[PDB]
Amino acid sequence: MKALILVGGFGTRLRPLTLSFPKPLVDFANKPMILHQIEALKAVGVDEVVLAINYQPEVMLNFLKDFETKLEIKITCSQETEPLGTAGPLALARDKLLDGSGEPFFVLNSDVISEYPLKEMLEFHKSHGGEASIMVTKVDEPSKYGVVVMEESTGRVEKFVEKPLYVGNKINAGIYLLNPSVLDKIELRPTSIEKETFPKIAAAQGLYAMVLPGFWMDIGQPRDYITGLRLYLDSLRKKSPAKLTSGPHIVGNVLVDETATIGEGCLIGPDVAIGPGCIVESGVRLSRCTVMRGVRIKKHACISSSIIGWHSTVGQWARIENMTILGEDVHVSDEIYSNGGVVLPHKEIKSNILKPEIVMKLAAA
Ligand SMILES: Nc1nc2c(ncn2[C@@H]2O[C@H](COP(=O)(O)OP(=O)(O)O[C@H]3O[C@H](CO)[C@@H](O)[C@H](O)[C@@H]3O)[C@@H](O)[C@H]2O)c(=O)[nH]1
């Protein structure tokens, strides 16, 4: 059984984090983004995973090479030449997805986080004997996504419309399970899976949708990255609560790597992820933030609703809030305030950053 992960490019919308590591390698909840999906694929018996990418794969071959041996799984890159769309790279990796076993393959959107009930999706797939299965989840604004109108009891989808006028409340969750026959409806040309391939399969009465249990989020923009960690950590509390840390210094759900250190007098939480090798000194306040590998938060600093990149340094009594994104190896001096700062890697912040909402929503004029 095979799987393909639609990655895309390096990730412009996630700068300055993606100036150091490509989109699938950026840490989410203390492990590289791509590992959340590769681990879920291995759990259901996938033996090879193809990364449909846009860039030179040498930059991430060192990362995957250890995870290949560690997870006992094969990872190959399928770099495209020209923009092939969302169904194009499915045909560019036709030789890698079809081994002759006749078994279906998974297709995952790399920007999507969920619980991945792939085992239940596999038995759902065999039950209806259809050509393609897709996961669906409800949202409040089904207009920024692609609505899947479907019939109950069977799950057969009736149409796959994109950028719709309320046509339904279920949307494509970016988790596909496709039979080998799907690859016959895709040419080796730029083609869109949501506009062409899925409507065809629905017309042939062979497209089925399964309601996705649990959380779902498309972490494209860093604002959704903060919301994504909250939903993930809530899922972790329900499935395996012992993986979250607790104590008098903890409020809500906090995920601390085993090699991180927390000094006395801290107040960490809610919705905080502290990466490996981190040093949180005394009297630090962290909330709704991601602290990546190897950063140091000095005494009495207060970080909220922000993302501190790898190997950054936050000075004593520094105050970081309101979606501040620090790149790799950013040094924030003592007693500095940052509101909405977006700092390129390796920079030293010696002056305050003042980009509040009232400031930005007033500079429009
Ligand atoms: N190999 C390759 N990958 C691409 C390309 N274009 C986009 N991708 C990647 O495929 C994924 C889909 O991203 P978009 O093309 O921007 O579509 P979308 O607006 O985000 O919406 C789609 O995803 C939602 C999440 O499941 C769906 O809800 C929605 O229905 C739709 O399928 C992303 O990870 C993107 O990097 C391409 O030309 N080639």
Author numbering: 1 to 164, 166 to 366
Task: Quote the paper.
Plant vitamin C biosynthetic pathway contains conversion of D-mannose-1-phosphate (Man-1-P) to GDP-D-mannose (GDP-Man), a step catalyzed by the Man-1-P guanylyltransferase which is commonly named GDP-Man pyrophosphorylase (GMPase). Arabidopsis thaliana VTC1 is the first genetically characterized plant GMPase and has unique properties when compared with bacterial and animal homologs. Structures of two GMPases have been reported, which are the crystal structure of GMPase from the hyperthermophilic bacterium Thermotoga maritima (TmGMP) and the cryo-EM structure of human GMPase (GMPPA-GMPPB complex) that is arranged into a dodecamer. These structures show that an oligomer-forming monomer (protomer) of GMPase consists of two domains: an N-terminal Rossmann fold-like domain and a C-terminal left-handed β-helix (LβH) domain. VTC1 dimerizes via its LβH domain and forms a dodecamer in crystal.
